Amino acid sequence: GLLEKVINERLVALARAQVSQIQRELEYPLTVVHGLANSTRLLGEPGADGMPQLNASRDEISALLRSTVQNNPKLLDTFMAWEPNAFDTDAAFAGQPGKGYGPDGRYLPWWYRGADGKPIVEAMADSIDSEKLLPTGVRENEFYACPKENKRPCIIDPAPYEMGGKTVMMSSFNVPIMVGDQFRGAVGADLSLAFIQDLLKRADQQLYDGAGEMALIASNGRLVAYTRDDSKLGEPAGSVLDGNEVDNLKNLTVDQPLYDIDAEHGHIELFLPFTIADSGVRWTLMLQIPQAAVFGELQQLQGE
Amino acid sequence: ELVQQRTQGLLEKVINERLVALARAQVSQIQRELEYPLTVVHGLANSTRLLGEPGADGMPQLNASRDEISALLRSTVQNNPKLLDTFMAWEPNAFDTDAAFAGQPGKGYGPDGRYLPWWYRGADGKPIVEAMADSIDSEKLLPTGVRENEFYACPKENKRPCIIDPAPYEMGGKTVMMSSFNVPIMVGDQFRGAVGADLSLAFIQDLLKRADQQLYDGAGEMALIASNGRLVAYTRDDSKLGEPAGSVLDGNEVDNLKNLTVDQPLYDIDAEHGHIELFLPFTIADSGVRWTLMLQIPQAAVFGELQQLQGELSDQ
Ligand SMILES: CC(=O)OCC[N+](C)(C)C
Ligand SMILES: CC(=O)OCC[N+](C)(C)C
Ligand SMILES: [Ca+2]
């Protein structure tokens, strides 16, 4: 039908705007940490006098990280890990705690905000080499192993980490520190799922007057956000969504919308896969809207 | 017969709502792409300000030389192919004594030592630097209605990010629209300088041309109008980019743009000229930009569609 087509084109356009709004949120941390990687690699790149182009101390690099946290309130944190002896001699820094160094001197700072909002630092010695499987299906060290192994940017699916006495679910945005063809380390920043969820909830309230719900699904099919119920974050979409929805989640092409009508529940399903910057990472936005909210004007024309 | 009017009004609403949603989608896509240069230059500003912000020891948090700051700018160009350039300018004696660096323009300094590097790519793609001494203090008006130094004066005056209305630029034997994206280097409450990068806006022309094909077999036009009234994009004709929008649109409509409200759509049915227009003002981040997307549809296309929709209702 021609009228159905005009209504459905409105729906797709509204969904596409929700995707580009989410991309703005998710591409931002990647560009932040690209900036830090593009600066830090100058520690290892000679200049016209044969000395490093950046001769910054560890205290100065940490200042850059802390300034990132300070002036990027949307980011949960900023962190960086060097390979053993990547840019200096770790042994000179061994036995110095509370600076983000491992016990052997390896540079591993994780900067985030304490209770008063002031930045504090934790060394990632415990997680950087950990093969522990977290309950969301993510290994504890994947924020570093993935950029080390693939030598390109990595976005990690939702995972819980302990932060100042509480468990925080988060996704990390990671870039390798490359000098030539050599992996020297990686730098990253997290977004909390609570942050992404709050934004998706607010965005949903402006979509068809809030009649429906949205789900953001990571590369492993687990929920980054789910406007109906915060308790489902991190959980598999296959343990929260419909048989029909879970099937449609398998029916998707690489980057192309899937439209479906769940008559059993009287709502429209729209799945839009999308990629995050040039990282090649593909997540999915799901819109679930009551049929009456989308087709109310048709209902009104036919009703009279 | 009032049933006919109520029915026609509801069909027109469905049509108008589709066009509004299409407009909002172009705005959202434009905002996604144009955050990128702001994030890059925010990173450079947030590093450079540490030259003047003390630590607990009372001493600055970053003890970097001018050469090291320039290396950060050079690395930005090298590692962001989409950016045309990256440039930074300090206030006189902002972080050191300019006079100690006088007489060395080959490093991006002014003649009396002011730090003014502009880094771009030479013919072989390797970055090279030039001093901005000839532009940094110039309030000469460009055709676009901005000062030659707007990229610096606007962040100095407003102490927040500034996106300068685009200027034409030759790229690959074609003229494209180019804007700079600028942020202040703030130490406490003090403006110390600014850092920016230029980005081509050709992707907007391409975006809007593709979107304009979705509706009415491409019979409409889409435009993006800057605050100076000039065309950032115009799907009908690449040759019009950078021209006053009043050359393709009723002049008083263009004069009216300053009165519109951000994110509020506005329809104008110009029955005299047989076109309907939808305007959608928008901004970018905290830059305070005032840009307007415009969708123009011929009345004959809409009328024909309404007849088809009524025909489908009749046949029900
Ligand atoms: C416990 C720990 O060190 O976590 C580090 C990983 N990160 C920054 C992604 C949370
Ligand atoms: C080439 C070009 O875009 O001119 C503007 C350069 N700027 C803004 C650094 C002075
Ligand atoms: Ca369903």
Side-chain angles (χ1 to χ4, degrees), chain B residues 253-267:
Chain B
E253 277 178 316
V254 174
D255 306 303
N256 188 214
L257 297 183
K258 63 176 195 275
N259 308 321
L260 300 180
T261 301
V262 69
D263 306 324
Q264 176 58 63
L266 178 68
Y267 270 102

PDB file of all heavy atoms in Angstrom, chain B residues 253-267:
ATOM      1  N   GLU B 253      12.582  34.751   2.739  1.00  0.00           N
ATOM      2  CA  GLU B 253      12.762  33.488   3.448  1.00  0.00           C
ATOM      3  C   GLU B 253      14.168  33.387   4.029  1.00  0.00           C
ATOM      4  O   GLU B 253      14.349  33.011   5.194  1.00  0.00           O
ATOM      5  CB  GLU B 253      12.476  32.326   2.494  1.00  0.00           C
ATOM      6  CG  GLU B 253      11.004  31.993   2.364  1.00  0.00           C
ATOM      7  CD  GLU B 253      10.726  30.867   1.383  1.00  0.00           C
ATOM      8  OE1 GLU B 253      11.318  30.854   0.301  1.00  0.00           O
ATOM      9  OE2 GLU B 253       9.920  29.974   1.720  1.00  0.00           O
ATOM     10  N   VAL B 254      15.182  33.743   3.235  1.00  0.00           N
ATOM     11  CA  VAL B 254      16.561  33.690   3.720  1.00  0.00           C
ATOM     12  C   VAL B 254      16.764  34.682   4.858  1.00  0.00           C
ATOM     13  O   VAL B 254      17.439  34.380   5.854  1.00  0.00           O
ATOM     14  CB  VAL B 254      17.543  33.955   2.562  1.00  0.00           C
ATOM     15  CG1 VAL B 254      18.973  34.057   3.090  1.00  0.00           C
ATOM     16  CG2 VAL B 254      17.422  32.857   1.507  1.00  0.00           C
ATOM     17  N   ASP B 255      16.185  35.882   4.728  1.00  0.00           N
ATOM     18  CA  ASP B 255      16.258  36.863   5.803  1.00  0.00           C
ATOM     19  C   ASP B 255      15.600  36.347   7.077  1.00  0.00           C
ATOM     20  O   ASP B 255      15.987  36.740   8.182  1.00  0.00           O
ATOM     21  CB  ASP B 255      15.596  38.176   5.373  1.00  0.00           C
ATOM     22  CG  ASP B 255      16.158  38.723   4.063  1.00  0.00           C
ATOM     23  OD1 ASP B 255      17.389  38.942   3.982  1.00  0.00           O
ATOM     24  OD2 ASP B 255      15.376  38.919   3.105  1.00  0.00           O
ATOM     25  N   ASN B 256      14.604  35.472   6.945  1.00  0.00           N
ATOM     26  CA  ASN B 256      13.863  34.944   8.076  1.00  0.00           C
ATOM     27  C   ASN B 256      14.655  33.896   8.866  1.00  0.00           C
ATOM     28  O   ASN B 256      14.273  33.578  10.008  1.00  0.00           O
ATOM     29  CB  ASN B 256      12.545  34.327   7.559  1.00  0.00           C
ATOM     30  CG  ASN B 256      11.610  33.911   8.681  1.00  0.00           C
ATOM     31  OD1 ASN B 256      10.886  32.916   8.565  1.00  0.00           O
ATOM     32  ND2 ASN B 256      11.565  34.705   9.741  1.00  0.00           N
ATOM     33  N   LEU B 257      15.752  33.371   8.307  1.00  0.00           N
ATOM     34  CA  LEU B 257      16.437  32.245   8.950  1.00  0.00           C
ATOM     35  C   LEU B 257      16.953  32.607  10.338  1.00  0.00           C
ATOM     36  O   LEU B 257      16.960  31.752  11.242  1.00  0.00           O
ATOM     37  CB  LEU B 257      17.603  31.768   8.089  1.00  0.00           C
ATOM     38  CG  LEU B 257      17.263  31.221   6.710  1.00  0.00           C
ATOM     39  CD1 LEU B 257      18.548  30.722   6.032  1.00  0.00           C
ATOM     40  CD2 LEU B 257      16.231  30.121   6.775  1.00  0.00           C
ATOM     41  N   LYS B 258      17.368  33.862  10.530  1.00  0.00           N
ATOM     42  CA  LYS B 258      17.901  34.283  11.822  1.00  0.00           C
ATOM     43  C   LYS B 258      16.875  34.174  12.939  1.00  0.00           C
ATOM     44  O   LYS B 258      17.263  34.122  14.109  1.00  0.00           O
ATOM     45  CB  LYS B 258      18.411  35.727  11.729  1.00  0.00           C
ATOM     46  CG  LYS B 258      17.330  36.748  11.408  1.00  0.00           C
ATOM     47  CD  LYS B 258      17.900  38.161  11.432  1.00  0.00           C
ATOM     48  CE  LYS B 258      16.795  39.210  11.481  1.00  0.00           C
ATOM     49  NZ  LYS B 258      16.280  39.555  10.119  1.00  0.00           N
ATOM     50  N   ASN B 259      15.585  34.117  12.609  1.00  0.00           N
ATOM     51  CA  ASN B 259      14.527  34.072  13.606  1.00  0.00           C
ATOM     52  C   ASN B 259      14.098  32.661  13.958  1.00  0.00           C
ATOM     53  O   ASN B 259      13.274  32.490  14.854  1.00  0.00           O
ATOM     54  CB  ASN B 259      13.302  34.851  13.116  1.00  0.00           C
ATOM     55  CG  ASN B 259      13.650  36.255  12.672  1.00  0.00           C
ATOM     56  OD1 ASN B 259      14.479  36.923  13.291  1.00  0.00           O
ATOM     57  ND2 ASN B 259      13.018  36.712  11.593  1.00  0.00           N
ATOM     58  N   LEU B 260      14.600  31.656  13.256  1.00  0.00           N
ATOM     59  CA  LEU B 260      14.162  30.288  13.506  1.00  0.00           C
ATOM     60  C   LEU B 260      14.749  29.765  14.815  1.00  0.00           C
ATOM     61  O   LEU B 260      15.722  30.296  15.358  1.00  0.00           O
ATOM     62  CB  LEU B 260      14.543  29.381  12.328  1.00  0.00           C
ATOM     63  CG  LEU B 260      13.933  29.779  10.982  1.00  0.00           C
ATOM     64  CD1 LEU B 260      14.339  28.856   9.858  1.00  0.00           C
ATOM     65  CD2 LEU B 260      12.419  29.905  11.026  1.00  0.00           C
ATOM     66  N   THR B 261      14.129  28.718  15.325  1.00  0.00           N
ATOM     67  CA  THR B 261      14.521  28.090  16.579  1.00  0.00           C
ATOM     68  C   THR B 261      15.199  26.755  16.297  1.00  0.00           C
ATOM     69  O   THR B 261      14.686  25.956  15.503  1.00  0.00           O
ATOM     70  CB  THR B 261      13.303  27.852  17.484  1.00  0.00           C
ATOM     71  OG1 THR B 261      12.671  29.085  17.749  1.00  0.00           O
ATOM     72  CG2 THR B 261      13.717  27.162  18.790  1.00  0.00           C
ATOM     73  N   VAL B 262      16.331  26.519  16.970  1.00  0.00           N
ATOM     74  CA  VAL B 262      17.110  25.306  16.756  1.00  0.00           C
ATOM     75  C   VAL B 262      16.244  24.080  16.999  1.00  0.00           C
ATOM     76  O   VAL B 262      15.455  24.030  17.953  1.00  0.00           O
ATOM     77  CB  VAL B 262      18.340  25.332  17.677  1.00  0.00           C
ATOM     78  CG1 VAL B 262      17.903  25.181  19.128  1.00  0.00           C
ATOM     79  CG2 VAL B 262      19.349  24.248  17.295  1.00  0.00           C
ATOM     80  N   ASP B 263      16.364  23.091  16.109  1.00  0.00           N
ATOM     81  CA  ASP B 263      15.668  21.808  16.120  1.00  0.00           C
ATOM     82  C   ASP B 263      14.165  21.914  15.937  1.00  0.00           C
ATOM     83  O   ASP B 263      13.475  20.906  16.058  1.00  0.00           O
ATOM     84  CB  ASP B 263      15.952  21.014  17.420  1.00  0.00           C
ATOM     85  CG  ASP B 263      17.405  20.827  17.687  1.00  0.00           C
ATOM     86  OD1 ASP B 263      18.186  20.653  16.715  1.00  0.00           O
ATOM     87  OD2 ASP B 263      17.789  20.902  18.880  1.00  0.00           O
ATOM     88  N   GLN B 264      13.626  23.091  15.588  1.00  0.00           N
ATOM     89  CA  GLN B 264      12.202  23.245  15.348  1.00  0.00           C
ATOM     90  C   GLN B 264      11.940  23.279  13.848  1.00  0.00           C
ATOM     91  O   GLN B 264      12.346  24.245  13.185  1.00  0.00           O
ATOM     92  CB  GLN B 264      11.699  24.531  16.008  1.00  0.00           C
ATOM     93  CG  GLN B 264      10.234  24.863  15.745  1.00  0.00           C
ATOM     94  CD  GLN B 264       9.284  23.764  16.199  1.00  0.00           C
ATOM     95  OE1 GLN B 264       9.213  23.463  17.391  1.00  0.00           O
ATOM     96  NE2 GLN B 264       8.562  23.170  15.261  1.00  0.00           N
ATOM     97  N   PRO B 265      11.276  22.274  13.275  1.00  0.00           N
ATOM     98  CA  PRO B 265      10.938  22.347  11.851  1.00  0.00           C
ATOM     99  C   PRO B 265       9.903  23.423  11.570  1.00  0.00           C
ATOM    100  O   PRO B 265       9.026  23.728  12.391  1.00  0.00           O
ATOM    101  CB  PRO B 265      10.401  20.945  11.534  1.00  0.00           C
ATOM    102  CG  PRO B 265       9.965  20.393  12.858  1.00  0.00           C
ATOM    103  CD  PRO B 265      10.912  20.966  13.872  1.00  0.00           C
ATOM    104  N   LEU B 266       9.971  23.959  10.347  1.00  0.00           N
ATOM    105  CA  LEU B 266       9.014  24.973   9.899  1.00  0.00           C
ATOM    106  C   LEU B 266       8.703  24.765   8.430  1.00  0.00           C
ATOM    107  O   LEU B 266       9.611  24.833   7.601  1.00  0.00           O
ATOM    108  CB  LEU B 266       9.595  26.371  10.115  1.00  0.00           C
ATOM    109  CG  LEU B 266       8.666  27.460   9.632  1.00  0.00           C
ATOM    110  CD1 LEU B 266       7.416  27.542  10.489  1.00  0.00           C
ATOM    111  CD2 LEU B 266       9.367  28.828   9.586  1.00  0.00           C
ATOM    112  N   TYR B 267       7.430  24.543   8.112  1.00  0.00           N
ATOM    113  CA  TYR B 267       6.973  24.492   6.727  1.00  0.00           C
ATOM    114  C   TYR B 267       6.622  25.885   6.220  1.00  0.00           C
ATOM    115  O   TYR B 267       6.107  26.722   6.962  1.00  0.00           O
ATOM    116  CB  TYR B 267       5.752  23.600   6.566  1.00  0.00           C
ATOM    117  CG  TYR B 267       6.104  22.173   6.274  1.00  0.00           C
ATOM    118  CD1 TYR B 267       6.044  21.212   7.269  1.00  0.00           C
ATOM    119  CD2 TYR B 267       6.533  21.779   5.013  1.00  0.00           C
ATOM    120  CE1 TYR B 267       6.394  19.891   7.006  1.00  0.00           C
ATOM    121  CE2 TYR B 267       6.878  20.468   4.737  1.00  0.00           C
ATOM    122  CZ  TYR B 267       6.792  19.525   5.753  1.00  0.00           C
ATOM    123  OH  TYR B 267       7.131  18.221   5.492  1.00  0.00           O
TER     124      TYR B 267
END
